[PDB]
Amino acid sequence: EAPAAVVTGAAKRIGRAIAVKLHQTGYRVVIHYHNSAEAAVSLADELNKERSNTAVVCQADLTNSNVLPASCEEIINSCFRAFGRCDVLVNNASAFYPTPLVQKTVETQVAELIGTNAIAPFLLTMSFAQRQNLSIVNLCDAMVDQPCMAFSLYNMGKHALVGLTQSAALELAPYGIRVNGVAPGWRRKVPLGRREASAEQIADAVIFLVSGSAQYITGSIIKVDGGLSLVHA
Amino acid sequence: EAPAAVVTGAAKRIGRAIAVKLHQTGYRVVIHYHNSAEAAVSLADELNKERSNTAVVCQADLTNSNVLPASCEEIINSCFRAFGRCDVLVNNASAFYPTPLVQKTVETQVAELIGTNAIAPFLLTMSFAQRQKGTNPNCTSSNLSIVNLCDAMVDQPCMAFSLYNMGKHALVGLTQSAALELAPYGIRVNGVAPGVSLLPVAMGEEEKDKWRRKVPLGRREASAEQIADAVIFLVSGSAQYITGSIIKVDGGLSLVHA
Amino acid sequence: EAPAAVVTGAAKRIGRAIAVKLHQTGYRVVIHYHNSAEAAVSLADELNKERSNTAVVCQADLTNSNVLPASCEEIINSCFRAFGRCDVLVNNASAFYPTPLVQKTVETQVAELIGTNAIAPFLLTMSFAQRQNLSIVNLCDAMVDQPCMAFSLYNMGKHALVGLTQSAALELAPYGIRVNGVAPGVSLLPVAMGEEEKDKWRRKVPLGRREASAEQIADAVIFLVSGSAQYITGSIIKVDGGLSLVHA
Amino acid sequence: EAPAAVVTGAAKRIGRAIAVKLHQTGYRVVIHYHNSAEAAVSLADELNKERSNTAVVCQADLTNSNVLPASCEEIINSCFRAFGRCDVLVNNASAFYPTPLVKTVETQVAELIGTNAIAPFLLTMSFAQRQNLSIVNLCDAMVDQPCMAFSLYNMGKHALVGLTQSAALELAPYGIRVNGVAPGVSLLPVAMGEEEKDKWRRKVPLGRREASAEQIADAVIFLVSGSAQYITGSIIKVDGGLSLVHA
Ligand SMILES: NC(=O)c1ccc[n+]([C@@H]2O[C@H](COP(=O)([O-])OP(=O)(O)OC[C@H]3O[C@@H](n4cnc5c(N)ncnc54)[C@H](OP(=O)(O)O)[C@@H]3O)[C@@H](O)[C@H]2O)c1
Ligand SMILES: NC(=O)c1ccc[n+]([C@@H]2O[C@H](COP(=O)([O-])OP(=O)(O)OC[C@H]3O[C@@H](n4cnc5c(N)ncnc54)[C@H](OP(=O)(O)O)[C@@H]3O)[C@@H](O)[C@H]2O)c1
Ligand SMILES: NC(=O)c1ccc[n+]([C@@H]2O[C@H](COP(=O)([O-])OP(=O)(O)OC[C@H]3O[C@@H](n4cnc5c(N)ncnc54)[C@H](OP(=O)(O)O)[C@@H]3O)[C@@H](O)[C@H]2O)c1
Ligand SMILES: NC(=O)c1ccc[n+]([C@@H]2O[C@H](COP(=O)([O-])OP(=O)(O)OC[C@H]3O[C@@H](n4cnc5c(N)ncnc54)[C@H](OP(=O)(O)O)[C@@H]3O)[C@@H](O)[C@H]2O)c1
Ligand SMILES: COC(=O)C1CCN(C(=O)c2ccc(N(C)Cc3cnc4nc(N)nc(N)c4n3)cc2)CC1
Ligand SMILES: COC(=O)C1CCN(C(=O)c2ccc(N(C)Cc3cnc4nc(N)nc(N)c4n3)cc2)CC1
Ligand SMILES: COC(=O)C1CCN(C(=O)c2ccc(N(C)Cc3cnc4nc(N)nc(N)c4n3)cc2)CC1
């Protein structure tokens, strides 16, 4: 039977490119969305036209709250209901905006930036593991140690996601679940800037990590940034 | 006039050693505590007996909630109310317990582990920096800094401690992000990262010795004073160009392979 | 035509598996060796039996010395002589043994451990770049920051190789050359190591309690040289089963 | 009795400030130098005027070669001959210049890798064999965002991080701590135009200035002190936040 994958924030941009490549590789896909229902269904339509009944959508707000654990349980359950299995979880959904230290309430910003970027991946990881070539791929940040000015909460959530990638790789290794990261990265600064950055390049690294060609790789974060993290101020 | 410091979780153990050494160095100190009221008051009493009116206590829960920003503002405000200034913030308080991925509510665990280790340090950092805006300038003798208590083992985490390790990773992120953003205000932001220091009071001696035997330098845990020494260096004039640095105080533990 | 690759220390073990997988992917290969002449020639024979004129051997000592630049130049020149091009360089050859701080001359140990692990990759990188989907892959070590006791010079060499990987990625990007690393943890154990000691190392690995096969290491090299990694440069991929994440 | 320290490349700039601060803390010092004899002797004379018989000089080339192990043994021996003990070794001497990928290259290898990595290793060996003991290595906070065309220098500083960690592990049972101090931008070249110096200064978040040599020395003094007794294998950045700044 065909393996199945959940991709969060899959309606647009990087998540969409990842869902497309997984589907092209032979996966059935759950396309998670929060607000982008039209785009999520448009993508499912396109994938189902290629292979009938191989793409479904799942709505969830990934902001931290009292109901986030049940929402994340539901996303994983939707994979099992549609496809009878869940082989791959891609934690792609992300919020991104500045939160200056010196001057939405700040606690709403915490619930969004830390909740979407770190807590929902944690809850999804728990639900994926509890329900069990299995693997999880977290979308990290190549610039995590040279943060953007005034992005403290965003940077904290991306740091927490490194910690989850490493902790979950160690704890889920006995279950045969690998846990890795892809870290995307102005153009004139990128060493490989002759090539334009694309969502498909990020998806290519995800496809490698979920493949049999990465069966010994766990706890690894692959930077896909054209060399930008190497460039000094 | 003597400078003033806030130390979170300062009633006992490492936070107390930090408060004691700051006080011996000449600081007035706010001893924040959550549940350890008797121990906090006992410490404040000892410090005030050494020099009158140089220590106060401040009670707060640092679990995340919609009131946490007000709590953290109030901790900083307590320093200014007692002492008229706040030169140093030490983010020491920390919840620590396992949260296995495979089997309190999990949302309570998130609020405790991520709140104490990361969100409260972030809000305290916001409040510390914001309160400096009103102060008179001291362009000649000002030495403002924040020290976060990190973990030397953050990249070799303990089994089944994902939320704890996520919170400590976020604290590294805060340390570096706040160092960049607050440098223009002359506020330095650094970390001290213990490996094995004081073992839990409830841990059996056999288990404590298992941890001690891992440490290359002396096969023993760091004393609380050894952790405090690195905090004292980072707040001192001898560290005036250091910002965004995390000093491991771990006896070589993080260098040891499986 | 078919692209061409140099793999150093390719007669046996991980370098052999890399040369084989590059050849299976469509590369012509230079099999570099130092002492393993019979194994190198046998491998070239096997690869040429599959596709004629797609494999050659090249012999060189990669110990540092005043002739090392000439040797490294000649390895790259051997790829151009055989195949007319050189698209990929894999720096795999490596000396590995203890050099305790407290008690071969020590200068010979320096020349061997720092030469093979760092200086030869640097000179090979210079000659590869000068002679021009181009890329270099360096075989690093996932344990570089939790080093084996009494392996100072080896560990220094591997740290220097990380610096080279990053510095050359930065400097050679304008020429379209990507430079990345693959960092094994425990892969193929030494032939001379007893079974009990091998099992000790295997038991450390979270993912499967086993060493990486040479083929698993080669799979990461194949990815990095591929069109699916064209925006990756300066990255070191650990292939370690989670070993580097395990505390004391 | 007073402890003793060897500082390499101690005639000028950061090494000089280290040697002065160690001497002010109460150490007797061996001032190693390569070409700067007049400045090394001037420093020793200044320190001996302050307290008699507390400073000597030791000349050596720290380029890698057949004779480097004997040179490094002789530097450590000079401390024992003058002062009867050697408590601290500071590996500060360093060659620094570009080596573009696209002097012979093997001379550049010998100089850049010898001064930054091989000589620290051999000095570490001789220091340990001869035994609050500690070694401090002068690292580089920018080691993972290197300057364009400085591959050999960067390789040498990466190797020095590996030495700092390997030696901390191996020498811990002997009670010898091994740590690093990693400057970002500190003293710029005297000949560098102020317009270029200002380009570097403006990069630094904390004060838009370079570190003084004395600020680097303050971190060394901490690491050799009793206040760092449990610290080994640590590298302390003294960089004003520079390493945290993205391109
Ligand atoms: N773009 C880059 O260059 C870059 C750089 C570094 C890292 N990354 C990482 O790569 C991943 C994808 O990047 P991207 O630019 O494609 O992401 P993006 O478009 O900024 O957002 C990704 C998706 O996350 C979902 N999302 C946002 N807030 C949410 C919430 N509160 N609850 C539920 N879903 C929410 C959105 O889904 P709906 O639209 O359905 O609401 C959105 O489509 C992210 O993890 C990002 O951090 C990207
Ligand atoms: N001990 C070690 O070996 C070690 C190792 C690595 C890192 N560290 C770090 O070093 C620091 C000091 O360690 P430690 O062992 O001394 O810490 P600890 O005893 O475990 O905790 C310090 C204090 O944290 C306060 N705290 C806990 N939950 C709280 C909450 N919800 N609200 C407010 N305060 C709360 C407690 O205050 P009350 O007692 O008043 O309730 C407690 O006394 C911590 O950040 C720790 O993570 C320590
Ligand atoms: N095996 C592991 O578990 C492991 C772990 C971490 C990293 N690695 C890295 O992965 C790579 C492959 O490892 P491996 O175990 O397959 O390597 P290996 O068998 O120890 O050595 C590979 C080859 O290096 C060549 N070599 C040694 N000294 C040389 C010299 N002076 N001049 C020229 N060539 C020389 C030898 O060639 P001849 O046989 O032709 O003389 C040898 O066959 C190495 O870079 C290694 O550091 C391996
Ligand atoms: N300056 C900075 O901004 C900066 C930044 C990052 C890291 N660092 C590190 O901090 C340390 C001190 O920096 P610095 O700028 O003061 O260094 P420096 O002036 O460039 O060099 C220090 C001394 O190294 C000695 N040296 C050079 N080549 C030598 C050789 N072949 N043999 C023996 N000694 C040799 C020279 O001694 P003689 O003059 O006696 O010949 C020189 O005075 C160095 O390790 C450096 O890499 C400095
Ligand atoms: C249900 O509760 C449990 O299961 C306990 C048993 C498992 N624990 C440890 O393995 C463990 C591992 C390392 C430790 N330390 C090196 C000491 C220690 C002691 N107190 C601490 N307190 C805080 N806040 N943070 C720390 N990192 C910390 N660390 C301590 C305990 C502690 C929690
Ligand atoms: C002359 O004496 C020797 O060669 C020593 C090297 C092997 N020893 C090990 O403890 C040891 C530790 C870890 C090992 N591995 C994880 C396997 C391994 C096997 N071959 C290798 N080859 C190279 N080049 N580099 C490596 N990192 C490497 N690694 C192997 C041996 C002790 C004996
Ligand atoms: C052809 O020769 C050249 O092109 C020279 C001019 C180019 N250089 C610099 O731009 C440069 C960049 C940064 C610098 N610093 C941050 C100051 C500095 C000054 N002296 C040093 N000395 C050593 N040993 N190590 C250092 N890192 C060091 N660093 C200094 C010069 C140095 C070599």
Side-chain angles (χ1 to χ4, degrees), chain C residues 64-65 101 107 145 155 159 163 166-167 171 175, chain D residues 64-65 101-102 106 129 144 154 158 162 165-166 170:
Chain C
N64 197 43
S65 77
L101 292 170
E107 281 292 349
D145 292 316
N155 182 238
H159 268 275
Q166 294 176 161
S167 288
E171 187 174 352
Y175 301 91
Chain D
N64 196 227
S65 77
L101 291 170
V102 288
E106 275 292 347
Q129 193 68 46
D144 293 305
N154 181 241
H158 266 271
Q165 297 177 157
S166 289
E170 186 169 354

PDB file of all heavy atoms in Angstrom, chain C residues 64-65 101 103 107 145 155 159 163 166-167 171 175, chain D residues 64-65 101-102 106 129 144 154 158 162 165-166 170, unseen atoms left out:
ATOM      1  N   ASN C  64      51.094  15.168   4.820  1.00  0.00           N
ATOM      2  CA  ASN C  64      51.607  16.468   4.453  1.00  0.00           C
ATOM      3  C   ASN C  64      53.123  16.420   4.235  1.00  0.00           C
ATOM      4  O   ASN C  64      53.845  15.736   4.967  1.00  0.00           O
ATOM      5  CB  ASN C  64      51.308  17.522   5.527  1.00  0.00           C
ATOM      6  CG  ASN C  64      51.470  18.935   4.984  1.00  0.00           C
ATOM      7  OD1 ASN C  64      51.021  19.217   3.868  1.00  0.00           O
ATOM      8  ND2 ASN C  64      52.143  19.795   5.718  1.00  0.00           N
ATOM      9  N   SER C  65      53.580  17.165   3.233  1.00  0.00           N
ATOM     10  CA  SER C  65      55.022  17.313   2.959  1.00  0.00           C
ATOM     11  C   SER C  65      55.108  18.413   1.921  1.00  0.00           C
ATOM     12  O   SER C  65      54.089  18.848   1.370  1.00  0.00           O
ATOM     13  CB  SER C  65      55.615  16.030   2.336  1.00  0.00           C
ATOM     14  OG  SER C  65      55.250  15.935   0.941  1.00  0.00           O
ATOM     15  N   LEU C 101      48.398  13.026  24.779  1.00  0.00           N
ATOM     16  CA  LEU C 101      49.125  14.231  25.170  1.00  0.00           C
ATOM     17  C   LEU C 101      50.200  13.968  26.205  1.00  0.00           C
ATOM     18  O   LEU C 101      51.177  14.710  26.266  1.00  0.00           O
ATOM     19  CB  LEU C 101      48.164  15.297  25.703  1.00  0.00           C
ATOM     20  CG  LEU C 101      47.229  15.870  24.644  1.00  0.00           C
ATOM     21  CD1 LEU C 101      46.165  16.710  25.330  1.00  0.00           C
ATOM     22  CD2 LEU C 101      47.986  16.767  23.676  1.00  0.00           C
ATOM     23  N   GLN C 103      52.722  10.900  28.043  1.00  0.00           N
ATOM     24  CA  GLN C 103      53.353   9.593  27.850  1.00  0.00           C
ATOM     25  C   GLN C 103      53.716   8.952  29.172  1.00  0.00           C
ATOM     26  O   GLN C 103      52.933   8.188  29.735  1.00  0.00           O
ATOM     27  N   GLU C 107      56.088  14.729  14.727  1.00  0.00           N
ATOM     28  CA  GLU C 107      55.905  15.459  13.460  1.00  0.00           C
ATOM     29  C   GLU C 107      55.349  14.575  12.333  1.00  0.00           C
ATOM     30  O   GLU C 107      54.551  15.054  11.492  1.00  0.00           O
ATOM     31  CB  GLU C 107      57.125  16.302  13.046  1.00  0.00           C
ATOM     32  CG  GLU C 107      57.187  17.629  13.827  1.00  0.00           C
ATOM     33  CD  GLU C 107      56.074  18.639  13.499  1.00  0.00           C
ATOM     34  OE1 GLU C 107      55.286  18.498  12.525  1.00  0.00           O
ATOM     35  OE2 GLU C 107      55.957  19.625  14.234  1.00  0.00           O
ATOM     36  N   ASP C 145      32.683  17.230  18.300  1.00  0.00           N
ATOM     37  CA  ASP C 145      32.603  17.993  19.550  1.00  0.00           C
ATOM     38  C   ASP C 145      32.450  17.136  20.784  1.00  0.00           C
ATOM     39  O   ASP C 145      32.325  17.669  21.896  1.00  0.00           O
ATOM     40  CB  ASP C 145      31.493  19.023  19.463  1.00  0.00           C
ATOM     41  CG  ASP C 145      31.807  20.140  18.459  1.00  0.00           C
ATOM     42  OD1 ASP C 145      32.974  20.679  18.434  1.00  0.00           O
ATOM     43  OD2 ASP C 145      30.876  20.474  17.695  1.00  0.00           O
ATOM     44  N   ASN C 155      41.259  14.748  15.917  1.00  0.00           N
ATOM     45  CA  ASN C 155      40.100  15.611  16.118  1.00  0.00           C
ATOM     46  C   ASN C 155      40.391  17.037  15.591  1.00  0.00           C
ATOM     47  O   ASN C 155      39.513  17.648  14.958  1.00  0.00           O
ATOM     48  CB  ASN C 155      39.781  15.657  17.612  1.00  0.00           C
ATOM     49  CG  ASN C 155      38.571  16.494  17.890  1.00  0.00           C
ATOM     50  OD1 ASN C 155      38.634  17.466  18.651  1.00  0.00           O
ATOM     51  ND2 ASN C 155      37.470  16.170  17.249  1.00  0.00           N
ATOM     52  N   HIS C 159      38.186  18.925  12.816  1.00  0.00           N
ATOM     53  CA  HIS C 159      37.723  20.311  13.001  1.00  0.00           C
ATOM     54  C   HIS C 159      38.174  21.238  11.899  1.00  0.00           C
ATOM     55  O   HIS C 159      37.374  21.989  11.325  1.00  0.00           O
ATOM     56  CB  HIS C 159      38.196  20.865  14.344  1.00  0.00           C
ATOM     57  CG  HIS C 159      37.234  20.668  15.425  1.00  0.00           C
ATOM     58  ND1 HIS C 159      36.210  21.550  15.651  1.00  0.00           N
ATOM     59  CD2 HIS C 159      37.101  19.661  16.315  1.00  0.00           C
ATOM     60  CE1 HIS C 159      35.478  21.103  16.658  1.00  0.00           C
ATOM     61  NE2 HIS C 159      36.001  19.961  17.080  1.00  0.00           N
ATOM     62  N   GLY C 163      36.156  23.692   9.026  1.00  0.00           N
ATOM     63  CA  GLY C 163      36.500  25.046   8.626  1.00  0.00           C
ATOM     64  C   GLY C 163      36.700  25.137   7.129  1.00  0.00           C
ATOM     65  O   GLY C 163      36.236  26.074   6.474  1.00  0.00           O
ATOM     66  N   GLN C 166      33.315  25.087   5.239  1.00  0.00           N
ATOM     67  CA  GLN C 166      32.621  26.381   5.294  1.00  0.00           C
ATOM     68  C   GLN C 166      33.351  27.469   4.501  1.00  0.00           C
ATOM     69  O   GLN C 166      32.694  28.205   3.715  1.00  0.00           O
ATOM     70  CB  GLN C 166      32.441  26.787   6.749  1.00  0.00           C
ATOM     71  CG  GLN C 166      31.463  25.776   7.417  1.00  0.00           C
ATOM     72  CD  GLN C 166      31.198  25.932   8.906  1.00  0.00           C
ATOM     73  OE1 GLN C 166      30.190  25.415   9.414  1.00  0.00           O
ATOM     74  NE2 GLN C 166      32.083  26.599   9.616  1.00  0.00           N
ATOM     75  N   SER C 167      34.693  27.556   4.636  1.00  0.00           N
ATOM     76  CA  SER C 167      35.464  28.593   3.949  1.00  0.00           C
ATOM     77  C   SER C 167      35.409  28.388   2.435  1.00  0.00           C
ATOM     78  O   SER C 167      35.220  29.349   1.692  1.00  0.00           O
ATOM     79  CB  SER C 167      36.921  28.574   4.367  1.00  0.00           C
ATOM     80  OG  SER C 167      37.059  29.050   5.677  1.00  0.00           O
ATOM     81  N   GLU C 171      33.916  30.766  -0.599  1.00  0.00           N
ATOM     82  CA  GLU C 171      34.834  31.299  -1.618  1.00  0.00           C
ATOM     83  C   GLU C 171      34.582  30.752  -3.006  1.00  0.00           C
ATOM     84  O   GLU C 171      34.809  31.454  -3.983  1.00  0.00           O
ATOM     85  CB  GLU C 171      36.267  31.042  -1.201  1.00  0.00           C
ATOM     86  CG  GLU C 171      37.329  31.689  -2.095  1.00  0.00           C
ATOM     87  CD  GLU C 171      38.689  31.493  -1.496  1.00  0.00           C
ATOM     88  OE1 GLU C 171      38.769  31.004  -0.332  1.00  0.00           O
ATOM     89  OE2 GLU C 171      39.668  31.899  -2.130  1.00  0.00           O
ATOM     90  N   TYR C 175      32.001  30.531  -8.363  1.00  0.00           N
ATOM     91  CA  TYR C 175      32.441  29.677  -9.483  1.00  0.00           C
ATOM     92  C   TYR C 175      31.477  28.516  -9.715  1.00  0.00           C
ATOM     93  O   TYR C 175      31.755  27.616 -10.521  1.00  0.00           O
ATOM     94  CB  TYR C 175      33.838  29.113  -9.210  1.00  0.00           C
ATOM     95  CG  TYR C 175      34.866  30.196  -9.001  1.00  0.00           C
ATOM     96  CD1 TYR C 175      35.148  30.697  -7.715  1.00  0.00           C
ATOM     97  CD2 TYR C 175      35.552  30.734 -10.084  1.00  0.00           C
ATOM     98  CE1 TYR C 175      36.070  31.711  -7.527  1.00  0.00           C
ATOM     99  CE2 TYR C 175      36.488  31.739  -9.905  1.00  0.00           C
ATOM    100  CZ  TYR C 175      36.738  32.223  -8.627  1.00  0.00           C
ATOM    101  OH  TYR C 175      37.654  33.223  -8.475  1.00  0.00           O
TER     102      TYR C 175
ATOM    103  N   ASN D  64      55.270  25.433  11.768  1.00  0.00           N
ATOM    104  CA  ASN D  64      55.488  23.983  11.824  1.00  0.00           C
ATOM    105  C   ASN D  64      56.761  23.589  11.062  1.00  0.00           C
ATOM    106  O   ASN D  64      57.049  24.118   9.981  1.00  0.00           O
ATOM    107  CB  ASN D  64      54.297  23.214  11.274  1.00  0.00           C
ATOM    108  CG  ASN D  64      54.333  21.738  11.675  1.00  0.00           C
ATOM    109  OD1 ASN D  64      54.127  20.835  10.838  1.00  0.00           O
ATOM    110  ND2 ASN D  64      54.710  21.485  12.918  1.00  0.00           N
ATOM    111  N   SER D  65      57.485  22.642  11.642  1.00  0.00           N
ATOM    112  CA  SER D  65      58.707  22.116  11.011  1.00  0.00           C
ATOM    113  C   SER D  65      59.165  20.935  11.842  1.00  0.00           C
ATOM    114  O   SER D  65      58.622  20.682  12.904  1.00  0.00           O
ATOM    115  CB  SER D  65      59.838  23.167  11.040  1.00  0.00           C
ATOM    116  OG  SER D  65      60.405  23.222  12.351  1.00  0.00           O
ATOM    117  N   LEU D 101      41.848  30.356  -2.554  1.00  0.00           N
ATOM    118  CA  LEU D 101      41.807  29.013  -3.167  1.00  0.00           C
ATOM    119  C   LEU D 101      42.105  29.048  -4.653  1.00  0.00           C
ATOM    120  O   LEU D 101      42.610  28.062  -5.175  1.00  0.00           O
ATOM    121  CB  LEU D 101      40.454  28.357  -2.951  1.00  0.00           C
ATOM    122  CG  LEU D 101      40.248  27.991  -1.483  1.00  0.00           C
ATOM    123  CD1 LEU D 101      38.805  27.572  -1.249  1.00  0.00           C
ATOM    124  CD2 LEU D 101      41.154  26.892  -0.986  1.00  0.00           C
ATOM    125  N   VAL D 102      41.769  30.169  -5.310  1.00  0.00           N
ATOM    126  CA  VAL D 102      41.903  30.324  -6.785  1.00  0.00           C
ATOM    127  C   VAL D 102      42.805  31.497  -7.171  1.00  0.00           C
ATOM    128  O   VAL D 102      42.793  32.517  -6.483  1.00  0.00           O
ATOM    129  CB  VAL D 102      40.517  30.467  -7.460  1.00  0.00           C
ATOM    130  CG1 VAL D 102      39.793  29.139  -7.427  1.00  0.00           C
ATOM    131  CG2 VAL D 102      39.673  31.516  -6.757  1.00  0.00           C
ATOM    132  N   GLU D 106      52.908  25.539   0.869  1.00  0.00           N
ATOM    133  CA  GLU D 106      53.267  24.719   2.038  1.00  0.00           C
ATOM    134  C   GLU D 106      53.912  25.562   3.156  1.00  0.00           C
ATOM    135  O   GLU D 106      53.767  25.221   4.323  1.00  0.00           O
ATOM    136  CB  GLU D 106      54.162  23.539   1.652  1.00  0.00           C
ATOM    137  CG  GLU D 106      53.351  22.337   1.170  1.00  0.00           C
ATOM    138  CD  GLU D 106      52.493  21.632   2.256  1.00  0.00           C
ATOM    139  OE1 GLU D 106      52.638  21.854   3.476  1.00  0.00           O
ATOM    140  OE2 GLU D 106      51.662  20.785   1.900  1.00  0.00           O
ATOM    141  N   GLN D 129      53.208  17.224  30.211  1.00  0.00           N
ATOM    142  CA  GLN D 129      54.250  16.238  30.538  1.00  0.00           C
ATOM    143  C   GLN D 129      55.115  16.692  31.702  1.00  0.00           C
ATOM    144  O   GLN D 129      55.546  15.882  32.525  1.00  0.00           O
ATOM    145  CB  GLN D 129      55.124  15.985  29.318  1.00  0.00           C
ATOM    146  CG  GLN D 129      56.028  14.769  29.435  1.00  0.00           C
ATOM    147  CD  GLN D 129      55.253  13.444  29.449  1.00  0.00           C
ATOM    148  OE1 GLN D 129      54.335  13.229  28.634  1.00  0.00           O
ATOM    149  NE2 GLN D 129      55.618  12.551  30.378  1.00  0.00           N
ATOM    150  N   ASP D 144      32.795  30.396  12.510  1.00  0.00           N
ATOM    151  CA  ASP D 144      31.775  29.813  11.622  1.00  0.00           C
ATOM    152  C   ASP D 144      31.154  30.762  10.601  1.00  0.00           C
ATOM    153  O   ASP D 144      30.210  30.382   9.880  1.00  0.00           O
ATOM    154  CB  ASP D 144      30.724  29.067  12.433  1.00  0.00           C
ATOM    155  CG  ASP D 144      31.286  27.824  13.118  1.00  0.00           C
ATOM    156  OD1 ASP D 144      31.891  26.902  12.450  1.00  0.00           O
ATOM    157  OD2 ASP D 144      31.127  27.788  14.353  1.00  0.00           O
ATOM    158  N   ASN D 154      41.380  29.977   8.927  1.00  0.00           N
ATOM    159  CA  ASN D 154      40.118  29.501   9.515  1.00  0.00           C
ATOM    160  C   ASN D 154      40.262  28.026   9.900  1.00  0.00           C
ATOM    161  O   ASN D 154      39.800  27.592  10.952  1.00  0.00           O
ATOM    162  CB  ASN D 154      38.981  29.725   8.544  1.00  0.00           C
ATOM    163  CG  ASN D 154      37.654  29.291   9.099  1.00  0.00           C
ATOM    164  OD1 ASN D 154      36.994  28.412   8.549  1.00  0.00           O
ATOM    165  ND2 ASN D 154      37.268  29.882  10.230  1.00  0.00           N
ATOM    166  N   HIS D 158      39.778  26.552  13.618  1.00  0.00           N
ATOM    167  CA  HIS D 158      38.872  25.430  13.902  1.00  0.00           C
ATOM    168  C   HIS D 158      39.661  24.313  14.603  1.00  0.00           C
ATOM    169  O   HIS D 158      39.171  23.703  15.543  1.00  0.00           O
ATOM    170  CB  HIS D 158      38.279  24.901  12.626  1.00  0.00           C
ATOM    171  CG  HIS D 158      36.975  25.486  12.300  1.00  0.00           C
ATOM    172  ND1 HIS D 158      35.790  24.953  12.741  1.00  0.00           N
ATOM    173  CD2 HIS D 158      36.650  26.583  11.569  1.00  0.00           C
ATOM    174  CE1 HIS D 158      34.775  25.681  12.294  1.00  0.00           C
ATOM    175  NE2 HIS D 158      35.267  26.666  11.562  1.00  0.00           N
ATOM    176  N   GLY D 162      39.155  22.298  18.328  1.00  0.00           N
ATOM    177  CA  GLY D 162      39.222  20.856  18.560  1.00  0.00           C
ATOM    178  C   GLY D 162      40.255  20.540  19.615  1.00  0.00           C
ATOM    179  O   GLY D 162      40.000  19.689  20.480  1.00  0.00           O
ATOM    180  N   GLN D 165      38.915  21.387  23.155  1.00  0.00           N
ATOM    181  CA  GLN D 165      37.988  20.370  23.643  1.00  0.00           C
ATOM    182  C   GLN D 165      38.660  19.037  23.947  1.00  0.00           C
ATOM    183  O   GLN D 165      38.445  18.439  25.022  1.00  0.00           O
ATOM    184  CB  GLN D 165      36.854  20.210  22.651  1.00  0.00           C
ATOM    185  CG  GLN D 165      36.068  21.541  22.571  1.00  0.00           C
ATOM    186  CD  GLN D 165      34.927  21.608  21.588  1.00  0.00           C
ATOM    187  OE1 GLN D 165      34.001  22.444  21.759  1.00  0.00           O
ATOM    188  NE2 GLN D 165      34.947  20.764  20.583  1.00  0.00           N
ATOM    189  N   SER D 166      39.513  18.588  23.005  1.00  0.00           N
ATOM    190  CA  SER D 166      40.213  17.295  23.220  1.00  0.00           C
ATOM    191  C   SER D 166      41.127  17.333  24.444  1.00  0.00           C
ATOM    192  O   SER D 166      41.197  16.375  25.227  1.00  0.00           O
ATOM    193  CB  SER D 166      41.055  16.901  21.988  1.00  0.00           C
ATOM    194  OG  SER D 166      40.251  16.529  20.904  1.00  0.00           O
ATOM    195  N   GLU D 170      41.123  15.163  27.955  1.00  0.00           N
ATOM    196  CA  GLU D 170      42.237  14.292  28.271  1.00  0.00           C
ATOM    197  C   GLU D 170      43.007  14.741  29.522  1.00  0.00           C
ATOM    198  O   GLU D 170      43.597  13.918  30.230  1.00  0.00           O
ATOM    199  CB  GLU D 170      43.149  14.232  27.047  1.00  0.00           C
ATOM    200  CG  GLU D 170      44.279  13.245  27.175  1.00  0.00           C
ATOM    201  CD  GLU D 170      44.992  13.035  25.854  1.00  0.00           C
ATOM    202  OE1 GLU D 170      44.529  13.582  24.811  1.00  0.00           O
ATOM    203  OE2 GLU D 170      45.963  12.284  25.872  1.00  0.00           O
TER     204      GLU D 170
END
